[PDB]
């Protein structure tokens, strides 16, 4: 096949969701803190690198298609998989709604503008659909748009990773020194309280599967290249930091920012098409998506993410906590952990005895991964996690709707 | 067999844990509120009655032995069962530690007394073991002690359910009328915020199984009789309520109170022996308990609940939130829901097509039950639930320790 992508457009998507909506936001998240505190970054890159590897090498066995759900289909796979999915999908779709509200806001001024009344909402509801459609074109199409836009946003970031280096200068950061974060002990958790909840997505490559050239070769390479890119970009970017705290060409960045979300939203809906229209096969959803207007893509699927994505989009017009941490914008984030947690489970009970010897190694990196997945949750909105819980319980109750599976029965 | 109990000592245990540690605490939990507000009770008794039935008729199929775990062994049954268990057991044991600290405090005065320094803790650590041992004698023995003590505490409660009736008198409660709770809408949730988190245990009869005469006949009868008893006692007891709010024979009650916890702790450890030393068989824990010094009982088991129960007991000496809601005393309570939630799941995917026709009925009462289980969680300590979550995630991670199951593999 050839209308089904290739390494370089995929690793760009993997780097491109992770990158991503968060960078033009990170430093200030660590300025009201609590900044530098670079340790925070050392921990998190270790953790996420491990998570990237767990996936990297779980897809290297069975990819997938989902993924993060095939796997959960072998830490069960029914109930646990249908819930791993519902709860994932249910959090790629939800994510966008609060992703655009920001990416349009990177254009708040500069053409359009406007960008204030019912106009941001109605402009945003329009953009969502540009991408639903760019996928009905795709998928080889959306990843293509995607690769471009994210490279456009590499302009600035890796503009500083080398150009920014040649600039500042220098001991000013040393002036800002550490502190602001109250001592090593616990001041790391200012950075781990943000460096962490913005490194999500390492799944995407293990999530494509069907829509990548060779899964068994291209997919891992993708997750790893993507993450490594993401990590490095992260570090060399939030090291351009001298002391400030109060929150011509500069225009190219006020744009190359919404440019990261031009490619993003596409990638992310692409995954909400897959990590559902999948489970809509293997077993159940219910489905529906399907139905797959021939030659790939789920016309039905992404078009339902449209209707849906909208309906919220124009009620989070508007309040819901009028930006991130929306008590509903963040829950779609905690959600995505449960799939990470099960991916880790599977990357072991499917290495039954590993389809690969010399284990004392793997039995390690996945334990890191468990830690990442767990610690992320542990430092988090008390209300905002309790909700993630009530979700699961109702998602389960909602195998009233599915009253027909099996295993070990009367 | 005959050293393995019978209906009347079991339904007494079922009523006797549920009863139980909570009654001599309920009214004041609804006086700082928010009292009467009797609706709260109408809702909750419906909900719990349904939960009692879900169990009542899940054990009527497969009992069990656990139960609440055999069942979760068929909403999976591996991972989901080993977690349903860990999380249950891990919450019968924990529960006592904060159960005695109160039941000794019902003797705070009246012999011993003392009851203040390291004396309550060291007196409490002694009592725990009286019951560990009374079970190594049992189980036919502990349920026997149990039946007695809980009947001793019926003296007071159903002392008022009839004697109390002949007393007060009368329209005074009408004087206290409703209110204090701010309007029907949401004032019910003062009562449902306590009538609820004190009706736990309806499981116990489905939890015994092996240690009851006929499971298929005695067990349900037990859950239902127990709960009905518990419900009625509840209502006719917190209706002796005229107006008060500020918080010879009277002595018989200051004792017949710690008398409810003389029987309780025994019953409850009995279940932490079962709903583990079970799963220690069927599949994994790891086990260990076993080993079952012949003729029933798990000498090893309850003795480990002793060591364990202690170790906490003398660190919650002492603070931990120095009474209920201990942010660790309550989490052992939220825990117990996940087993309720899965019991409901199973009471369906094992009625695959029900081993019983005329379904529109059952498909109902279990939906109530889901609501009960879910709503209980939803109104709850934001921190205290987030913890229940992090538990599960680590319990799962902890099938690093169990890296050998199966279902649908490479």
Curated annotation (Swiss-Prot), chains A, B:
Its main location: membrane. Keywords: Amino-acid transport, Antiport, Cell inner membrane, Cell membrane, Membrane, Transmembrane, Transmembrane helix, Transport. One of its GO terms (biological process) is amino acid transport. The chain crosses the membrane at residues 8-19, 38-56, 82-107, 120-137, 139-166, 190-202, 222-242, 253-276, 299-315, 328-345, 364-379, 383-401. GO terms for cellular component: plasma membrane. Residues 20-37, 108-119, 167-189, 316-327, 380-382 are periplasmic. It comes from the Bacteria. InterPro entries: AA/rel_permease1, APC_superfamily. GO terms for molecular function: antiporter activity; identical protein binding. Optimum pH is 5.5 or less for Arg-Agm exchange, which slows dramatically as pH rises and is almost undetectable at pH 7.0 and higher. Changing residue 69 to F: Approximately wild-type antiport. Major component of the acid-resistance (AR) system allowing enteric pathogens to survive the acidic environment in the stomach. Exchanges extracellular arginine for its intracellular decarboxylation product agmatine (Agm) thereby expelling intracellular protons. Probably undergoes several conformational states in order to translocate the substrate across the membrane; keeps the substrate accessible to only 1 side of the membrane at a time by opening and closing 3 membrane-internal gates. Homodimer;each subunit has its own individual transport capacity. This is Arginine/agmatine antiporter. It comes from Escherichia coli O157:H7. The gene is adiC.
């Amino acid at each position: 096949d050839a209308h089904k992508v290739g390494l370089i457009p995929v690793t760009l998507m993997v780097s491109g969701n992770i990158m991503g909506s968060g960078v033009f936001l990170l430093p200030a998240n660590l300025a009201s803190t609590g900044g530098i505190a670079i340790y925070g970054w050392l921990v998190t890159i270790i953790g996420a690198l491990g998570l990237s590897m767990v996936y990297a090498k779980m897809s290297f066995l069975d990819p997938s298609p989902g993924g993060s759900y095939a796997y959960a289909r072998r830490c069960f796979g029914p109930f646990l998989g249908y819930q791993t999915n519902v709860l994932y999908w249910l959090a790629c779709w939800i994510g966008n709604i609060a992703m655009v509200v920001i990416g349009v806001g990177y254009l708040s001024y500069f053409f359009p503008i406007l960008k204030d009344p019912l106009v941001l909402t109605i402009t945003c509801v329009v953009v969502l659909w540009i991408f639903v459609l760019l996928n009905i074109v795709g998928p080889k199409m959306i990843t293509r748009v995607q690769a471009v836009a994210t490279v456009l946003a590499l302009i600035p970031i890796v503009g500083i990773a080398v150009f920014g280096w040649f600039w500042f200068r220098g001991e000013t950061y040393m002036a800002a020194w550490n502190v602001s974060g109250l001592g090593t002990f616990g001041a790391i958790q200012s950075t781990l309280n943000v460096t962490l909840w913005s490194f999500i997505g390492v799944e995407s490559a293990s999530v494509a599967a069907g829509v990548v050239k060779n899964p068994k070769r291209n997919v891992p390479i993708a997750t790893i290249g993507g993450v490594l890119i993401a990590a490095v970009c992260y570090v060399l970017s939030t090291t351009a930091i001298m002391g400030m705290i109060p929150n011509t060409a500069g225009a190219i960045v006020s744009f190359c920012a919404a440019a990261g979300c031009l490619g993003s939203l596409g990638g992310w809906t692409l995954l909400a098409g897959q990590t559902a229209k999948a489970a809509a096969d293997d077993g159940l959803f219910p489905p529906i998506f399907a139905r797959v207007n021939k030659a790939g893509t789920p016309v039905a699927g992404l078009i339902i993410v449209g209707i849906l994505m909208t309906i919220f989009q124009l009620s989070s017009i508007s309040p819901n906590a009028t930006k991130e941490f929306g008590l509903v914008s963040s829950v779609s984030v905690i959600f995505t952990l449960v799939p990470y947690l099960y991916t880790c489970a599977a990357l072991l009970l499917l290495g039954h005895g590993h389809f690969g010897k010399a284990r004392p190694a793997y039995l390690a990196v996945t334990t890191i991964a468990f830690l990442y997945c767990i610690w992320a949750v542990v430092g988090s909105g008390a209300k905002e996690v309790m909700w993630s819980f009530v979700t699961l319980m109702v998602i389960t109750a909602m195998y009233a709707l599915n009253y027909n599976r099996l295993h070990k029965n009367p």
